[PDB]
């Protein structure tokens, strides 16, 4: 299909302007910006029937679009509001029928923080399998706990002897709020990886929990003493124990 949205992840201070870029290679006439929000499905923000031809969707207000060229449909927020924390989807269509459907891009997670200082990278800790579990089930469960991050733009993955694994893994579907009473609470997320007792007890086996984090860019101001909460990987690890 061939959409790319830029950027894929973004944090923006309330009252800043921000633009989302939807790019197609297809030369298709019809482009769309929808936002996805719990309890509303996908709602149309604006659309474009062709070059320099744009009109308003049902959630128009707060957002402008521009269709300079065919290939690009740009979504712009003059003055960011917290209500505009959402997941943004671009869509493309040649004829808009059954056989020429809308094709969606992969989305953009944008959160509107009250302050860039509120952005923190995760800390990551691996917890070793409980002895009682091994002698009770002949299996071992590792837990990874990524805590303190904001916004909730992370990808957690397990690595065993330098390869990613999926079997035996399961990660919270949604992160948890550490301070639920803060509009800008920092987030926590956990995951389990489960192996045989045999596998855990083999000291040759290396286990790494990796948490990819999406944070500020080079172009973002940082005046605080703590390191800049840049896009980074943070990891914790454990060796098998005999």
């Amino acid at each position: 299909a061939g959409i790319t949205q830029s950027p894929r992840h973004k944090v923006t201070e309330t009252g800043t302007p921000v633009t989302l870029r939807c790019h197609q290679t297809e030369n298709h006439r019809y482009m769309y910006w929808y936002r996805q929000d719990p309890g509303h499905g996908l709602r149309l923000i604006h659309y474009s029937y062709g070059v320099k031809d744009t009109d308003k969707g049902e959630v128009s207000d707060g957002y402008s679009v521009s269709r300079s060229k065919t290939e690009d449909f740009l979504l712009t927020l003059e003055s960011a509001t917290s209500s505009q924390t959402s997941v943004y989807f671009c869509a493309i269509s040649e004829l808009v029928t059954g056989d020429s459907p809308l094709h969606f891009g992969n989305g953009t997670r944008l959160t509107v923080t009250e302050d860039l200082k509120n952005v923190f990278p995760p800390e990551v800790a691996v917890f070793e399998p409980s002895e009682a579990e091994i002698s009770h089930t002949q299996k071992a469960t590792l837990v990874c706990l990524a805590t303190g991050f904001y916004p909730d733009h992370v990808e957690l993955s397990w690595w065993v002897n330098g390869k990613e694994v999926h079997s035996g893994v399961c990660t919270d579907p949604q992160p948890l709020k550490e301070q639920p009473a803060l509009n800008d609470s920092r987030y926590a997320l956990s995951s389990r990886l489960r192996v045989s007792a045999t596998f855990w007890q083999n000291p040759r086996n290396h286990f790494r929990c990796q948490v990819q984090f999406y944070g500020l860019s080079e172009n973002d101001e940082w005046t605080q003493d703590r390191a800049k909460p840049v896009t980074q990987i943070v990891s914790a690890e454990a060796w098998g124990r005999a």
């Binding site: 070793e128 409980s130 009770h136 469960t141």
Partner: peptide, 30 residues
């Protein structure tokens, strides 16, 4: 010339636990 969506249905497919064995374990940091 556009799609209007429903609000969505989150489907959860549930596996059968062959041998349940409910237990709480304390793990310690590496």
């Amino acid at each position: 010339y556009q799609l209007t969506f429903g609000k969505g249905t989150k489907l959860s497919v549930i596996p059968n636990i062959q041998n349940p064995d409910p237990a709480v374990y304390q793990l310690r940091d590496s």
